[PDB]
Design a protein around this ligand. Structure first.
Ligand code: HEM
Ligand code: HEM
Ligand code: HEM
Ligand code: HEM
Lengths: 146, 141, 146, 141
């Protein structure tokens, strides 16, 4: 997408401070807590039927990891998401069947989780820049949808 | 919050549907899958080919649930409790989709009703597919 | 945007058939009926204060032909809706102060209006095509916004 | 609906909030202006530099309204009915932008309440701002 110099720079800098596997776990799980119909893709994973259960469910937290890790990598191709994400887009349409509304729901719980993590370091300007990033990644996920 | 006017409008309209309500309800799905292709992510079991039994069948079921809402218009919550459970607990369709199919259904009325789709009819039908939509999504969280 | 040429024909085909005028008054009107908070922009137009009143208001009708004319316009030029609409984009930000979300609403009302007017000629496929165009054209009008 | 453990949740995160209500009102709005610029269409009469006193002032007034709907959780209808006729009849803010300002107040709360912002609380406050948004848009048509 396009962000300024100064936009890009402020993404990159927080993210250096992020433990990708803890934040991944957290955002996954609060997805599934605050928007419980997200739960539909996940009922391999075992016991979802409380907020404590969810948050301390292993399969949750691995899956979080693995989605965040991909997002991580992504932040390093922020001139080229849609090519970055093309083949995941794919996947997630034709074999996973994930309605791309969940992408956006994850991106706004990600934002809420940065803020809780960072407190007053997650300024309004820096909010703004990750909103731009989170929207880019949704829409690049969603790009191959048919 | 449905005026008396609105009721009327809506009884009227869905009156005028009749017995094509199943046919209509197919063509709204059709319209939805072609125009808003995300919505197909909730039906990877179906064959969504033009003329699909499966869609025709589903579309009947939708229709009839709407005919039941019109019967009922003063106590929709009631009447549509099980399919509110269903969609909450079970199908777990994202609430943005509800919009999508309600516009498709408008679209299909418009196409079939050249007389009875007047402005005022349009507005009560939109408010009425909104309040259907709100009931079906009430128990999600 | 992205048509298919079997979608670019079914759009060009039908829109040779459109009265601008007529369809344009009707689209605008219904906007204002269905979603009355839209009338926040039009308070100079006259009495809006129930259905026959909005549809037969000559100032509705007039403006309704203005916008569908410009919409017209942009059909000639498909595959660069942003560089068509960027002036008018600017305008309806900095001068008019119109929420972009009103672009989406009219798009949908337009579809409504086509279906009512054309009947069983506005098939599912044609719809689909017209959906991509109006989404296109909303998006092109919102481009300028800051 | 809000359960009654939602209510607990909201009453004892907002009582947290306490006497910063305003300032946090204020930051929410800034957040929304910067992150979603189309909302600024409804403020073209404000100075929207940051720390204006118009923003200030409006943030207070947004947070005392929310303060009044947490006092009256069980009948926020009747509690909000002033400002629902205002936003229906006057202000006419398209309903989408109520999710954008709900977003940014959840972000603000999360930013300032690191102990009380659990999952379970997230969830309840999300719910609570969705309901205040529906009771604000209630009289719109
Ligand atoms: C930032 C947004 C996301 C990113 C980057 C992402 C990325 C990925 C990656 C890298 C995989 C593994 C793919 C290999 O299996 O190939 C995957 C699988 C998965 N994702 Fe996504 N994903 C995202 C959001 C979602 C969301 C929001 C849901 C649903 C709520 C979702 C549901 C799944 C499922 C069910 C699979 C299969 C898991 C295996 O089968 O265990 N993903 N995702
Ligand atoms: C007016 C709005 C809606 C009405 C009235 C309604 C009604 C129904 C009925 C009556 C069923 C059958 C429940 C017998 O199975 O019980 C159903 C099933 C289902 N609904 Fe909904 N529905 C609505 C909207 C939606 C939307 C927007 C989606 C997705 C885009 C969705 C996806 C489905 C799925 C996936 C099924 C299962 C289909 C089975 O597999 O056959 N529904 N709905
Ligand atoms: C299709 C999308 C649209 C197109 C192409 C479009 C086009 C235009 C054009 C050509 C004008 C005259 C412009 C002075 O002439 O330089 C205009 C102005 C006007 N439009 Fe838009 N418009 C769009 C949709 C909308 C919507 C949905 C709203 C709000 C509901 C809107 C509200 C305005 C208003 C308030 C003006 C000024 C009215 C006279 O000046 O009071 N437009 N538009
Ligand atoms: C949580 C939802 C919201 C709450 C509780 C609420 C609350 C309030 C209150 C208390 C007032 C002052 C009314 C004392 O004048 O009469 C007002 C006015 C104002 N509202 Fe809402 N507000 C909400 C959301 C929105 C949204 C989303 C927007 C637009 C993006 C908006 C735009 C406005 C504007 C333009 C005014 C007039 C302000 C100047 O003129 O003062 N509001 N709001």
């Amino acid at each position: 997408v396009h962000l300024t110099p100064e936009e890009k720079s402020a993404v990159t800098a927080l993210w250096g401070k992020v433990n990708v596997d803890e934040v991944g776990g957290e955002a996954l799980g609060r997805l599934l807590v605050v928007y419980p119909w997200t739960q539909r893709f996940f009922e391999s994973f075992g016991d979802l039927s409380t907020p404590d259960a969810v948050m301390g469910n292993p399969k949750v937290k691995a899956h979080g990891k693995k989605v965040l890790g991909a997002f991580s990598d992504g932040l390093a191709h922020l001139d080229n998401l849609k090519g970055t994400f093309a083949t995941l887009s794919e996947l997630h349409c034709d074999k996973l069947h994930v309605d791309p509304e969940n992408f956006r729901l994850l991106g706004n719980v990600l934002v809420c989780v940065l803020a809780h993590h960072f407190g007053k370091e997650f300024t309004p300007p820096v909010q703004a820049a990750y909103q731009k990033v989170v929207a880019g990644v949704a829409n690049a996920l969603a790009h191959k949808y048919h | 919050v449905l005026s008396p006017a609105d009721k009327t409008n809506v009884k009227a309209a869905w009156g005028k549907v009749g017995a094509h309500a199943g046919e209509y309800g197919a063509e709204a799905l059709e319209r939805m899958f072609l125009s808003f292709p995300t919505t197909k992510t909730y039906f990877p079991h179906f064959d969504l080919s033009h003329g699909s039994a499966q869609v025709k069948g589903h579309g009947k079921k939708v229709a009839d649930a709407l005919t039941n809402a019109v019967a009922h218009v003063d106590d929709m919550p009631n009447a549509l409790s099980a399919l509110s459970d269903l969609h909450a607990h079970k199908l777990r369709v994202d609430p943005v989709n509800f919009k999508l199919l309600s516009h498709c259904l408008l679209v299909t009325l418009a196409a079939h009703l050249p007389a009875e789709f007047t402005p005022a009819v349009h507005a009560s039908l939109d408010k009425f597919l909104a309040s259907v939509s709100t009931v079906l999504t009430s128990k999600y969280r």
